[model samples]
Target: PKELLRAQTNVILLNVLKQGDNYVYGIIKQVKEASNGEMELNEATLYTIFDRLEQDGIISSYWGDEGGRRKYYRLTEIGHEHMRLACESLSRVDKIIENLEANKK
Candidate 1:
């Protein structure tokens, strides 16, 4: 389940990037709605992920607009690369699942 959560988090970050600059609350709302409530992530977990991603240079944050109260996060160049690789890895997982399912027949 942890792996699944981690994978989903990566996808979520990329998806949010595609949508443009996003605040923490907005990301949480969109992900929850997009997953149909399957991913109800709490603030603590998201902040942890954000911190890790920022530290890794996969994401960048800034206080832009709204009197410096709002913090927005956008994907860095490294993040796009990371997302691409994550998708490729997920594709491999899909292939493995398909083969496994076929052999189980």
Candidate 2:
């Protein structure tokens, strides 16, 4: 994926996690579907992002109830706030691009 898509993937993944508590597998499934498989993300990439998010205090994880497979991941308040800010930033950039294009001759 390109840089833009990669960043969007991060935001979308966080958003998915914010949709109530979810496990790692669930997050992978959701992101894969949401991106229409365009991201082509695998387990390693997913975990890497999870690690970064966790380190940033944007999310936290715990073992699932079943105990068969250890599931994890839930958005922290910072995660939600970050998502909102990133969304606003993306929107602003989009508008800037539109305005810039308007003057192209």
Candidate 3:
């Protein structure tokens, strides 16, 4: 579903920030491995997410290895702040979910 995709996209962005810089294939591979094959996405869809993040100024992309094939993406300073806030947001949501679950039990 789109909701899951959006969450996975956020994780992808966070992972890229953690790694400092990454290429499309490498990021995809890393995420797939990290998720144990639960988060598989096609190149086109992933590129769309990348484009959206770039447009939002959360990330910047450039080539590598003197005209190489891979285009690498890295987080901007703003991206770091954005990820920090996202982490806090997710934590708050997690706590809310935990509280709801506790109430239901």
Model 2 lDDT, residue 52, Cα: 86
Better of 2 and 3 by lDDT: 2
Question: lDDT tens string, model 3, 16-82?
Answer: 5567698778787778887799877678877898898889887888888865577888887787887
| Candidate 2 overall lDDT versus native | 0.82
Task: Say which prediction, candidate 2 or candidate 3, comes out ahead on TM-score.
Answer: 2
How much lDDT does candidate 1 score? 0.83
Off by over 4 Å in 2: 1-3, 67-69
Best by TM-score: 2
lDDT of each: 0.83, 0.82, 0.79
User: Candidate 1 residues 11-35, lDDT tens each?
Assistant: 7767787569898788988888888
* lDDT of candidate 2 at residue 63, scale 0 to 100: 80
TM-score of 2: 0.80
In model 3, what is the error at residue 72, expressed in angstroms? 0.5
Runs off by more than 4 Å, candidate 1:
96-105
Weakest ten-residue segment in model 1 by summed lDDT: 10-19
Error of 2 at 22 (Å): 1.3
Q: Mind giving the per-residue lDDT tens digits that candidate 2 earns over 4-89?
A: 87787788888877688887667777777877886556788888888888998999888866648686788898898999999789
